[PDB]
Design an enzyme around this catalytic site. Sequence first.
Site, short mmCIF file in Angstrom:
data_model
loop_
_atom_site.label_atom_id
_atom_site.label_comp_id
_atom_site.label_asym_id
_atom_site.label_seq_id
_atom_site.Cartn_x
_atom_site.Cartn_y
_atom_site.Cartn_z
N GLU A 1 0.85 -1.18 0.00
CA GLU A 1 0.00 0.00 0.00
C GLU A 1 0.89 1.23 0.00
OE1 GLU A 1 -3.39 1.22 0.15
OE2 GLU A 1 -2.24 3.07 0.17
N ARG B 1 -20.43 16.13 0.74
CA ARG B 1 -20.55 15.16 1.82
C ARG B 1 -19.41 15.33 2.82
NH1 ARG B 1 -21.65 9.71 0.10
NH2 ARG B 1 -20.50 9.06 1.99
N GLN C 1 -27.49 11.52 8.72
CA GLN C 1 -27.42 10.24 9.39
C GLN C 1 -26.58 10.34 10.66
OE1 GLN C 1 -26.45 8.15 5.48
NE2 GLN C 1 -27.50 6.52 6.62
C1 FAD Z 1 -9.13 8.45 0.88
C2 FAD Z 1 -10.45 7.83 0.51
C3 FAD Z 1 -11.60 8.19 1.20
C4 FAD Z 1 -12.84 7.64 0.87
N1 FAD Z 1 -13.96 8.03 1.58
C5 FAD Z 1 -15.11 7.48 1.27
C6 FAD Z 1 -16.29 7.87 2.01
O1 FAD Z 1 -16.33 8.68 2.94
N2 FAD Z 1 -17.44 7.25 1.61
C7 FAD Z 1 -17.55 6.33 0.58
O2 FAD Z 1 -18.67 5.85 0.33
N3 FAD Z 1 -16.44 5.96 -0.11
C8 FAD Z 1 -15.29 6.51 0.22
N4 FAD Z 1 -14.17 6.14 -0.48
C9 FAD Z 1 -14.31 5.12 -1.53
C10 FAD Z 1 -14.35 3.70 -0.97
O3 FAD Z 1 -13.20 3.43 -0.17
C11 FAD Z 1 -14.36 2.69 -2.10
O4 FAD Z 1 -15.42 3.06 -2.98
C12 FAD Z 1 -14.64 1.29 -1.53
O5 FAD Z 1 -14.43 1.37 -0.13
C13 FAD Z 1 -13.84 0.10 -2.02
O6 FAD Z 1 -12.76 0.54 -2.86
P1 FAD Z 1 -11.40 -0.22 -2.92
O7 FAD Z 1 -11.00 -0.78 -1.68
O8 FAD Z 1 -11.48 -1.10 -4.14
O9 FAD Z 1 -10.46 0.99 -3.26
P2 FAD Z 1 -9.93 2.24 -2.44
O10 FAD Z 1 -10.69 2.35 -1.21
O11 FAD Z 1 -9.90 3.40 -3.32
O12 FAD Z 1 -8.51 1.85 -2.06
C14 FAD Z 1 -7.45 1.72 -3.04
C15 FAD Z 1 -6.13 1.71 -2.30
O13 FAD Z 1 -5.06 1.32 -3.20
C16 FAD Z 1 -3.93 2.12 -2.92
N5 FAD Z 1 -3.08 2.12 -4.11
C17 FAD Z 1 -3.42 2.60 -5.34
N6 FAD Z 1 -2.50 2.40 -6.26
C18 FAD Z 1 -1.50 1.71 -5.59
C19 FAD Z 1 -0.26 1.18 -6.00
N7 FAD Z 1 0.20 1.28 -7.26
N8 FAD Z 1 0.50 0.56 -5.08
C20 FAD Z 1 0.04 0.46 -3.83
N9 FAD Z 1 -1.12 0.91 -3.32
C21 FAD Z 1 -1.85 1.52 -4.26
C22 FAD Z 1 -4.50 3.48 -2.52
O14 FAD Z 1 -3.55 4.24 -1.78
C23 FAD Z 1 -5.71 3.05 -1.68
O15 FAD Z 1 -5.40 2.92 -0.30
C24 FAD Z 1 -12.91 6.68 -0.16
C25 FAD Z 1 -11.76 6.32 -0.85
C26 FAD Z 1 -10.53 6.88 -0.52
C27 FAD Z 1 -9.30 6.46 -1.28
C1 OZA Z 2 -26.98 4.83 -0.19
C2 OZA Z 2 -28.28 5.43 0.37
C3 OZA Z 2 -27.88 6.65 1.22
C4 OZA Z 2 -28.91 4.41 1.30
N1 OZA Z 2 -28.22 3.82 2.33
C5 OZA Z 2 -29.07 2.95 2.99
C6 OZA Z 2 -28.84 2.12 4.08
C7 OZA Z 2 -29.89 1.34 4.53
BR1 OZA Z 2 -29.62 0.21 6.03
C8 OZA Z 2 -31.14 1.36 3.92
C9 OZA Z 2 -31.35 2.20 2.83
C10 OZA Z 2 -30.33 3.00 2.35
C11 OZA Z 2 -30.20 3.95 1.27
C12 OZA Z 2 -31.21 4.36 0.25
C13 OZA Z 2 -30.83 5.73 -0.35
C14 OZA Z 2 -31.14 6.96 0.52
N2 OZA Z 2 -30.62 8.17 -0.11
C15 OZA Z 2 -31.57 9.29 -0.17
C16 OZA Z 2 -31.04 10.20 -1.28
C17 OZA Z 2 -30.05 9.36 -2.08
C18 OZA Z 2 -30.22 7.94 -1.52
C19 OZA Z 2 -28.97 7.04 -1.52
C20 OZA Z 2 -29.30 5.74 -0.76
C21 OZA Z 2 -31.33 7.15 -2.21
O1 OZA Z 2 -31.94 7.52 -3.21
N3 OZA Z 2 -31.58 6.00 -1.58
#
Ligand code: FAD
Ligand code: OZA
Length: 444
Positions: A33, A188, A228
């Site tokens: 990572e 957000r 929330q």
């Molecule tokens: C900083 C951050 C904050 C987030 N916050 C939210 C949030 O509040 N709410 C939400 O719904 N989603 C959030 N997300 C997105 C969420 O994490 C992902 O949509 C989901 O959790 C699963 O994605 P993933 O684990 O496949 O990838 P990611 O969570 O994006 O993780 C990818 C990881 O791979 C690492 N990486 C990338 N390229 C390389 C490489 N070449 N070598 C080594 N490591 C590498 C990155 O540093 C990262 O830690 C966030 C993502 C990030 C990166």
């Molecule tokens: C990911 C969201 C936030 C969510 N997360 C949940 C978690 C539970 Br346990 C049950 C229901 C939901 C739901 C429906 C939700 C509630 N939200 C209200 C405006 C956008 C959105 C996203 C979406 C929507 O249209 N449906």
Amino acid sequence: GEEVQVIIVGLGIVGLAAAIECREKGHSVHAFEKSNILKSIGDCIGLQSNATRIIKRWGDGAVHEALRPWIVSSKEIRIHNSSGRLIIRQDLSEVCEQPNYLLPRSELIRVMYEHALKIGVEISLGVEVCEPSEDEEGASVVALTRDGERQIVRGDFIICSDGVHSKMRKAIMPQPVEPRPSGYAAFRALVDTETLKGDPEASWVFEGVEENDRFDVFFLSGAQIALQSCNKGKVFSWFCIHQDTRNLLDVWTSPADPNEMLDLIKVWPIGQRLWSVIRHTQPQKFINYPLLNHKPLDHWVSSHGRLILIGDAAHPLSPAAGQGASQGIEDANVLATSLSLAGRQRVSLALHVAERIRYARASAVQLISHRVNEGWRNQDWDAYEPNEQNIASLPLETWIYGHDSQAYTEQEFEMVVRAVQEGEEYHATNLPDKLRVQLGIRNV
Ligand SMILES: Cc1cc2nc3c(=O)[nH]c(=O)nc-3n(C[C@H](O)[C@H](O)[C@H](O)COP(=O)(O)OP(=O)(O)OC[C@H]3O[C@@H](n4cnc5c(N)ncnc54)[C@H](O)[C@@H]3O)c2cc1C
Ligand SMILES: CC1(C)c2[nH]c3cc(Br)ccc3c2C[C@@]23CN4CCC[C@]4(C[C@@H]12)C(=O)N3
């Protein structure tokens, strides 16, 4: 007498889940990572029952016990209009019959990271993984450290869990396809609980939160807003889906202007009450995240079957979908289970079986999620009131959240093996059959 050697690239939620799944199933894991993943960044992640069913097995229940404070206790979604009038209470009794979690991403990462270390996952932070290669016998990567030093790392296969901006992806799909902007973005953030508690004008937001997490939704012209809480009011978070045609980068670090949110809501009757809470967001924590529509990849597994894309590297979903992290956790579970059923002498088979189990289901969730990104559910609020018609339904679909991916994989493994080895199409039953054709999903 030698364990499978798994290399993992990226320790977001999915890479950590893959590390835990593989290690708990008796495989050696070296995960890499590039960043300090413990840093406080982002806001809250939701994990639905399809993911908590997987998590419950880890460490004989240890991880679930660590996550117990974050179990969603909301019994309903309270749907309000631009006056703040409650229109509909949408029942969550079925959605929450089994646990769901809502918690800061940084806390979820911490819990998973500590468990991974405890069970003997080898973790190397500060490593940028580069230059994957493979042949019929094995795979390797280059571990690049910040001093510029390069170290070759060999293993049986490479899990590419490096997120939406995956550089590993080009080793599978060399031609990159840019996603389409939806025209929408989401403001957000987490609220600062300390300044929130000190504001008498915001005290209403704490009502009932020790017994039932707040889950309020408000529909205003140009906005879909949710407030929330989780963990008995220790954490509050909010989002606002709004129209935005600017060229926003899909990262979690860019500066965003809180006054844009105030402007959007202050012109409607409920705006001041919503702002009484939302204004307690720290200014450098206000994120405006674009909701981009990514197309399913053609496939996830490399030509020798020793690299696989999972998580957001394979099927990025916007945070408005609710199933993004949970689908990635299913990838981790199906892959580790397939590997365990196939064995070290059948690694390519394991990866191809996992891909055939996961692809249509993950792609259906991804394609449906484009609808919440494009605001299909909005109506003219001068004429209509919001109700269940306006709530995106991925989190309410039993075929998603009631699914047991491990049991499905165990029951179907030999049938998928047959399809792989005979060159026949495998028709998964872990999504509704009408959905494939309706969404235009082409099997791998
Ligand atoms: C900083 C951050 C904050 C987030 N916050 C939210 C949030 O509040 N709410 C939400 O719904 N989603 C959030 N997300 C997105 C969420 O994490 C992902 O949509 C989901 O959790 C699963 O994605 P993933 O684990 O496949 O990838 P990611 O969570 O994006 O993780 C990818 C990881 O791979 C690492 N990486 C990338 N390229 C390389 C490489 N070449 N070598 C080594 N490591 C590498 C990155 O540093 C990262 O830690 C966030 C993502 C990030 C990166
Ligand atoms: C990911 C969201 C936030 C969510 N997360 C949940 C978690 C539970 Br346990 C049950 C229901 C939901 C739901 C429906 C939700 C509630 N939200 C209200 C405006 C956008 C959105 C996203 C979406 C929507 O249209 N449906």
